[PDB]
Amino acid sequence: SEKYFVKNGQPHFLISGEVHYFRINPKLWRNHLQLLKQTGADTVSTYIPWDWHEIEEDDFDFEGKTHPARNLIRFIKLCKEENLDLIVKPGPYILAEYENQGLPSWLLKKLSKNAFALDENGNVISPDLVSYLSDEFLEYTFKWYDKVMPIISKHQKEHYGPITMMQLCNEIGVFQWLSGKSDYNPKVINLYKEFIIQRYKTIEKLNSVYSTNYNSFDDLKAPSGKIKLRSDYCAYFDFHLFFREYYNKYISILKNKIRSFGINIKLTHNIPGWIYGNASELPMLISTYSEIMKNHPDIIFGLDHIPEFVSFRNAHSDLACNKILEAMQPEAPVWAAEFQAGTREHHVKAYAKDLETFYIASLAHGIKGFNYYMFSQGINPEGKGFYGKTFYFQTALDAASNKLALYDSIKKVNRFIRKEQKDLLRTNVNSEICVGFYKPYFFTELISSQLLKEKKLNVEELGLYIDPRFLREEILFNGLLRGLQTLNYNYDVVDLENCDLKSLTAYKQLWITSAEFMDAETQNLLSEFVLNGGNLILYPAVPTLDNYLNRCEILKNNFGIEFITKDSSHKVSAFGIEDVFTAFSKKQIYNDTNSKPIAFTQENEICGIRKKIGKGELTILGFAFGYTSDEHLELIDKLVKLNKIKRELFVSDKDIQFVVRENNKSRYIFFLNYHNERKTFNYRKSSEEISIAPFSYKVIKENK
Amino acid sequence: SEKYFVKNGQPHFLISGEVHYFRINPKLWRNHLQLLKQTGADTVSTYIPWDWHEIEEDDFDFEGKTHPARNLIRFIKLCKEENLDLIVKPGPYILAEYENQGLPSWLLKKLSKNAFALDENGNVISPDLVSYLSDEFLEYTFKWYDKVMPIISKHQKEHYGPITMMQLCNEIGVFQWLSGKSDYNPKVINLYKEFIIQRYKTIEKLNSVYSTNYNSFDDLKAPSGKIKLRSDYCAYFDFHLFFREYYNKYISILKNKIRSFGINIKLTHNIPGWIYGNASELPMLISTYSEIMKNHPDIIFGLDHIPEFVSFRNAHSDLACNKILEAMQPEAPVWAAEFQAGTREHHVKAYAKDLETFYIASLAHGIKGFNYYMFSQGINPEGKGFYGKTFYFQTALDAASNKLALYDSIKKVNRFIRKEQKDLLRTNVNSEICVGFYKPYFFTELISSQLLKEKKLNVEELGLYIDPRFLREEILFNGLLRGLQTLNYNYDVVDLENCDLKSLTAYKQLWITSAEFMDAETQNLLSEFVLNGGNLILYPAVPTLDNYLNRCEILKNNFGIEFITKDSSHKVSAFGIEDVFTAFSKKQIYNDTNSKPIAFTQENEICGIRKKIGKGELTILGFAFGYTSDEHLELIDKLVKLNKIKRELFVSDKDIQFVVRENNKSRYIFFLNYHNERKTFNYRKSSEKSEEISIAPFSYKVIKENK
Ligand SMILES: OC[C@H]1O[C@H](Oc2ccccc2)[C@H](O)[C@@H](O)[C@@H]1O
Ligand SMILES: OC[C@H]1O[C@H](Oc2ccccc2)[C@H](O)[C@@H](O)[C@@H]1O
Ligand SMILES: [Ca+2]
């Protein structure tokens, strides 16, 4: 049932280290590789920078003719001689704090204006930033692939070379995320028009959905500026859908070109979204790959994990990300393509004792492989660094292959992983809670994000009051998921899109965090789930609109629900918990015919009910809570206990986190102390008395 | 020369604990006070909530007649019996996570719409947010003062009562900051119009400064919306000046009213600005008090320190804040009105082992007094909690008066303080570096802040490239001040406004972080500083404009500087350091005349020079760096060594922070490990058998030397 990497027909924990040959003295290449191998790592990973190897137009150096660190061929040869597999990442974009993000200077000087990503006025967004589908960009990308891909092909495992995986490009769409700017290149906009024509067929159909007054598709302009009208929201929503198809068109073109060279190894991509040691925005980035993930079963996405520190402040980020990736990519192992080792930023410390706990927590949280990023520090050649001379700090090895504090932490964790991998990789957690992932709430990177300074989405101007980004960050990510992890309740996440009803019935509860809008297919799915015998917890709103904010009351009508939205105090009572702080004055006040009232406003109006529908159960809360008080943890605990869900262990200290991973023969108990306090506690199933240091861990094995 | 509290003509370390009588079973009040006293605390501090005591309009209970915990009079008498002095804070605002920020529900229901803070449309900003100078608000505030102030007066120290200090209101302007919404109440806009007429006298004079074409003062409207023209920037700048006068009028009215009750105790106010464990915005909030601090020498401002954790991620916040308060309030001790104990938010943990280090770091960083907030947890009575039933977590005492883990940390710190306070309060750090505090760069809370959502200031639209908020946050707060602390070079901060040259002349170096604008007074001051023998480090710009973005080239002309602004790679070389990443493509390129070139662009154009001017030295760098790379620390170190400034100690681990504090009698060495690593290091004094020390993660050592 578990998904994991395989070597010699047995479960294999992929342990990779990132070592940038182009940033290391080649006299020390062998020493770096030997020290990486001696930690128990099996794989080494690097970019192959286009700028570094196509030194002038149609002048390629892979042999160190012009600089010894351009000897890619020797580096590949050394990986094989030192018994490491190799991951290669030839771009065209590498990012990696490399000047021009890896594109050649000669290329960026030579490209015409229409090869660049353009703002709505037709101005170049950045001299760094090409249009992914530019004819000229792809032609030059293809000429780079024509040189590097024959080398990669010849050095595949198949041909007793070390190369086992290749990444296509790097964090596709990350520049639109960080800037909050869409590419309005006329070639992109023509592709958007085609998408829209393909989707709606006639202007009459688009007008009926958007409430627009176009006489033809010629009238239609790409959305831009703030959303003022529901028609602007509709247009921006489809513009988000378009970019997900656009990114699939791009990676498909690279993939087909790669396959033409007989490259049959595993293809990868990498997911950004951490910043300042928080990952609450990474689900938005995962959502931009929805069309890639549906159309490429053979491309493995891995996570870029950048925790920076390890404490209760960010403990929930990596679990929530790993669970959402599992939801979106159920047929591949959850792995970290970039797994923090040292720090990209000198002033943002990465402590060995923090990262060691992160590595063990990551195992608890279901990770099946990782690539330490950066295992080895680099020195930027010839000022090719965007920032200073040095690439990364507090790594396992400095750029001269000096061992640093993190080295012995990685060796220790790797030795544990190698000892346990055969059993540990085959373990899962017993989740009786399912949490719905509704991707359209996440489709906002051009209008609502932590990184976008401008707020292009203001739901109150649309006659709404539940903002999807507030819902998905504060009520879901930092609220429910943080709360369940803090309470040591296992959950799984399920992608509600095309979701199999049969997959939902294993769970005792399904939790849906709902705004005022939800498509017909999802309202029908939740209707059928409850009628067939499921237990649904739904808050803060019964939805009444579809994704285009047109009337859709399927779930409301099927459940016999009636409500009025009314203003009250932020505080409610729920299940006899007084003073539960809620996000909104406006709440849903429910008619309680055939219902049990279970939550009350300060004036005793009914803002939550329970109800039997068909064979199933409904709990509807007409208010939004996250986790910002002890009453929130009390309320989640009461909700979980409605359907008699139990934690695996009794642990005497509530502030110890545990994860029980089991298969038929083996149990692992991961204890995690995310607190600056030496804790002593005892545990038993639902002497045995253990002490854990601050920001530390303990793993116990039990045979069944 | 140190400023410290004095008790009976001796240095006194003010150690207070916050204990909310209104949130504690009154049968347990005495036990809370006894346990606070047993930590060596000398004072207890509490809000007196208007909502709690004026239970209905004109129905007052201070005696526990309608609820036992309304017995303020008994709580005061218990403070006296348990030998604790008392700080009282009757508002009218208390915030304190109390429903309606302390204002009575009956008041907010009764007030007419023109008592509230309004947006530009005339919509109520928040049902909890009054207009400070609303006639209706002040009439009810005065009726509240009429009942609580006679009690406070009767129980003052000079009448043998325990009350020694009183806070006026609570964090004035904290609501205008957090919403980024200014009050457009007609009372406020009318006061602004009077302020503008008084400032400019004639519409012609205002039009000459702003470059506007108004026919009369009646055509001038309060600024709103984004700044698009230099005229919009001028209007918003005067609007900021007006709000500083507005807050001074509010506090002046409360002060005048209080003094009429015969209340002669020390008056206080409290500075907000920490959020998410970072204080980089606090200097903006303290700048909103510029006019109060000039007009009220007798109101002592204290800091509200909320670090949440204690690591390299926030190590520089408390020192930079303590130094900036000293700069604005040099005649009073640096103290924390609210000094984090436990956590206001269940999900935001406060570890005893973090806060213990914070307490010791605060001593190293020159704190002279504090009020542990919260010493005692509370339980909100009668649904009065804004956010939940429980007030604070992980405190020294739970609501029931049980000792929690933090209790023994506070007792340990208090014990050291009581043993050492006689010498420690008198100790100075030898600062040879002075950093200039240029208040106008901070005057942006209506247009540019971490908390404002809609950014109104875009300097590029004004033909500028150096944003004053980016400068003061990243180049100064997270850059130079962070860098000096990390490198263990002592610095002082000086307010450049009405700054006496004689106060600058004691330093080996003055560091000025400059935007393209700076007033004529400050350009003249810095000119005279260098001519008379001062050593000035100035970056990233020679300014060429005044506070209204009109021509002012005084400093440029006095220093014989010629420059052109040119685009280049972010990276420069400086003092032989290659690949120094700088914030901007645009750099100042200086003529080499009568100067040594010491920094070069990628085209080897000159973007920094050193020169001798009169008896002084000038170092100008035409590029912006904070601390986002190792090269930045190398550059700060190089600049400091230009005048042969030395650290107090050789320490074998550069990641150990230290402060040496000394007087004639005593030397204290404070070592601070802001890192999750057990560190073993050695040290010795820079002049004149190295000592070895092992320090735990996130921990401290203090060494006392006699002589
Ligand atoms: O911290 C923001 C992002 O920082 C990087 O991405 C960029 C891309 C362009 C410029 C700067 C950072 C990382 O690759 C990405 O994983 C991360 O989420
Ligand atoms: O963390 C934001 C602020 O949080 C509080 O301020 C408010 C004011 C109003 C509403 C909520 C918090 C603290 O008193 C203040 O010191 C702090 O800077
Ligand atoms: Ca019904």
Strand content of chain A: 15-25%
Assigned CATH class of the largest domain in chain A: Alpha Beta
Strand order of the largest sheet of chain A: 16-15-17-18-25-24-23-20-21
Q: Judging from the principal axes of the Cα atoms, what is the shape of chain A?
A: globular
Number of helices of chain A: 19
In angstroms, what separates the terminal alpha carbons of chain A?
19 Å
Oligomeric state as shown: homodimer
Helix content of chain A: 25-40%
Could you say what the CATH architecture of the largest domain in chain A is? Alpha-Beta Barrel
CATH topology of the largest domain in chain A: TIM Barrel
Largest contact between chains: A-B, 45 and 46 residues
Helical/strand content category of chain A: alpha/beta
Number of strands of chain A: 31
PDB class: transferase
Keywords: beta-1, 2-glucosyltransferase Glycoside, hydrolase family 35, hydrolase
Assembly: dimeric
Entry title: The complex structure of beta-1,2-glucosyltransferase from Ignavibacterium album with phenyl alpha-D-glucoside
